[PDB]
């Protein structure tokens, strides 16, 4: 069966963000009882105001659709209109910017778990233009976790290992080896996520997933950074900006493989981007869209493909984010229309016959690297109709 993941399927939709409303840096989850909301933010390109509406899909732990019917999981109707929008101001590339907060006055959630918001043009309800995915937690267990570059297979070389315990004194679970499903995500990436974990030990009030070989991740590197807050000067990692009607074009400085080196402390935001422009008080309507040109100078890597990776492509490894190789210049190259701001990014290699991207070949794997890991604990005892999300935590090093 089919999996729901945050992805854009329309060329007219850009800069899809899923974050906690009001937060600069966040994770795509909120508490069921809580005061926080998820914010889905995106632009539609063109001058047209367009009527978009959404459906709520309840999913199980693995992001396949659950068997629940809407009345079981939401209060409110499917096909609600997205009313909160505004036109671009003072930009070459025209667009409208849209914002949906959830839960809201029209839709509230009745159960925990994974949710997928599918958006469409009201005229064309069967063509989904994007899916935005977030989770809703009922936090009845506490998770104590650590990340170390000292792992079971090496010692401060190229890996990081996650270790955690589920503390459940106040939510006893008789058979957690069967009734829990755990997902662990590095830097909000699904491609190299881990699941099918077994506890190393189970006490009455503590379930330990420590020393688990599957919880060893390659360490990667700090993401590459780039900024283009105006067309007047060259921002960070920008070689030149030029205008070719109708767009400004940002030539980024040339990138090189970083795997053959020594770790360099850089401060990143683990693949995130931030929409910003010089002297803009509302970048969501004032930031323009420029063609950004990425260049990775190396010989082509055999037996796989290179993908541009980060929140800028929703961490999706597909034909949109895959990079072609220019054999005239001996470079991987890609042009991407992006809204002005600060971007993290990196280059992942996917070996042929795999769906898992690797930081090793181009970015390198350095145990010191600051990464984040989100641990999602889903609960499903025999006879329950759906996967509850009973704990979640994000740990850094």
Q: Which residues of this protein are in contact with its own copies, per CB under 8 A?
A: 139, 142-146, 148, 150, 152, 163-165, 167, 169, 201, 203, 205-206, 208, 210-211, 393
List the one residue from 27, 191, 268, 387 that touches Mg ion (CB under 5 A).
Answer: 268
Q: Give, as one character, the DSSP assignment of residue 65.
A: B
**Nearer to Mg ion by C-beta: 255 or 268?**
268
Please report whether residue 181 would count as binding Cl ion according to CB under 5 A.
yes
List the one residue from 58, 334, 339, 380 that touches Cl ion (CB under 5 A).
Answer: 334
Please report whether residue 335 would count as binding Cl ion according to CB under 5 A.
yes
The one of Mg ion, Cl ion, its own copies, none whose footprint includes residue 49, by CB under 5 to 8 A per kind, is none
The one of Mg ion, its own copies, Cl ion, none whose footprint includes residue 268, by CB under 5 to 8 A per kind, is Mg ion
- CB distance 138 to 390 below 8 Å: yes
Exposed e or buried b for every residue in 37-57, given b needs 16+ CB within 10 A? bbbbbbbbbeeeeeebbbbbb
The one of its own copies, Cl ion, Mg ion, none whose footprint includes residue 270, by CB under 5 to 8 A per kind, is Mg ion
- Cross-sheet strand order for the sheet of 13-20: 13-20, 38-45, 95-102, 85-87
Beta carbon of residue 90, minimum distance to its own copies (angstroms, whole number): 31
Residue numbers 184-203 binding Cl ion by CB under 5 A? 195-197
Distances (CA, A) of 317 to 236, 262, 313, 330: 26, 27, 8, 22
CA within 13 Å, CB half, 310: 23
Beta carbon of residue 211, minimum distance to its own copies (angstroms, whole number): 6
**Nearer to Cl ion by C-beta: 335 or 384?**
335
Beta carbon of residue 243, minimum distance to Mg ion (angstroms, whole number): 34
Please report whether residue 270 would count as binding Mg ion according to CB under 5 A.
yes
* Distance separating alpha carbons of residues 53 and 124, to the nearest angstrom: 10
* Distance separating alpha carbons of residues 43 and 127, to the nearest angstrom: 17
Say how many residues touch Mg ion, by CB under 5 A.
Answer: 4
- Beta bridge mates, 144: 165
- CB distance 198 to 211 below 8 Å: no
List the one residue from 370, 378, 379, 388 that touches Mg ion (CB under 5 A).
Answer: 370
Beta carbon of residue 397, minimum distance to its own copies (angstroms, whole number): 10
The one of Cl ion, its own copies, Mg ion, none whose footprint includes residue 210, by CB under 5 to 8 A per kind, is its own copies
User: Kind of pairing, strands 128-137 and 29-31?
Assistant: parallel
- Backbone φ, ψ for residue 259 (5° rounding): -80, -15
* Distance separating alpha carbons of residues 316 and 307, to the nearest angstrom: 9
The one of Mg ion, Cl ion, its own copies, none whose footprint includes residue 104, by CB under 5 to 8 A per kind, is none
The dihedral of CA 26, 238, 347, 149: what is its sign?
negative
The one of its own copies, Cl ion, Mg ion, none whose footprint includes residue 144, by CB under 5 to 8 A per kind, is its own copies
The one of Mg ion, Cl ion, its own copies, none whose footprint includes residue 211, by CB under 5 to 8 A per kind, is its own copies
Site residues, Mg ion (CB under 5 A): 222, 268, 270, 370
């Amino acid at each position: 069966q089919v999996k729901f993941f945050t992805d854009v399927n329309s060329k007219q939709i850009k800069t899809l963000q899923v974050k906690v409303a009001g937060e600069l840096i966040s994770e795509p989850y909120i508490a069921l009882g809580g005061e926080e909301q998820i914010e889905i933010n995106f632009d539609g390109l063109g001058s047209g105001y367009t009527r978009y509406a959404y459906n709520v899909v309840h999913c199980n732990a693995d992001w396949t659709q659950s068997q629940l019917s809407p009345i079981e999981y939401m209060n409110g109707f499917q096909g609600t209109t997205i009313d909160d929008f505004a036109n671009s101001i003072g930009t070459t590339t025209q667009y409208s910017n849209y914002r949906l907060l959830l839960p809201n006055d029209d839709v509230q959630f009745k159960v925990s778990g994974n949710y997928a918001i599918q958006v469409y043009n009201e005229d064309t309800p069967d063509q989904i233009i994007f899916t935005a995915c977030f989770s809703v937690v009922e936090p009845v267990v506490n998770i104590s976790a650590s990340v170390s570059g000292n792992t079971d297979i090496d010692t401060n070389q190229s890996h990081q290992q996650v270790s955690f315990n589920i503390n459940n004194k106040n939510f006893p679970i008789t058979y957690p080896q069967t009734d829990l499903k755990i997902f662990v995500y590095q830097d909000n990436r699904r491609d190299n996520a881990v699941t099918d974990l077994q506890p190393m030990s189970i006490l009455e009030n503590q379930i330990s997933y420590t020393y688990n070989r599957n919880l060893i991740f390659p360490a990667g590197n700090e993401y590459r950074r780039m900024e283009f807050l105006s067309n007047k000067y060259n921002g960070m990692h920008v070689e030149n900006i030029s205008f070719h009607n109708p767009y400004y074009n940002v030539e980024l400085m040339t990138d090189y493989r970083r795997d053959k080196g020594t770790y360099q402390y850089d401060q990143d935001q683990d693949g995130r981007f931030f929409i910003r422009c010089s002297d803009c008080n509302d970048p969501d309507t004032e930031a323009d869209y420029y063609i950004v040109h990425f260049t990775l100078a190396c010989d082509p890597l055999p037996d796989g493909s290179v993908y541009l990776n980060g929140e800028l492509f929703n961490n999706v490894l597909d034909e949109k984010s895959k990079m072609g190789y220019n054999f005239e210049t001996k470079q991987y190259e890609k042009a991407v229309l992006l809204k002005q701001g600060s971007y993290n990014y990196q280059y992942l290699f996917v070996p042929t016959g795999s769906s898992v991207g690797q930081t090793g070949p181009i970015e390198g794997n350095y145990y010191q690297t600051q990464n984040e890991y989100s641990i999602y604990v889903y609960y499903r005892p025999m006879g329950a109709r759906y996967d509850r999300l009973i704990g979640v935590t994000t740990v850094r090093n």
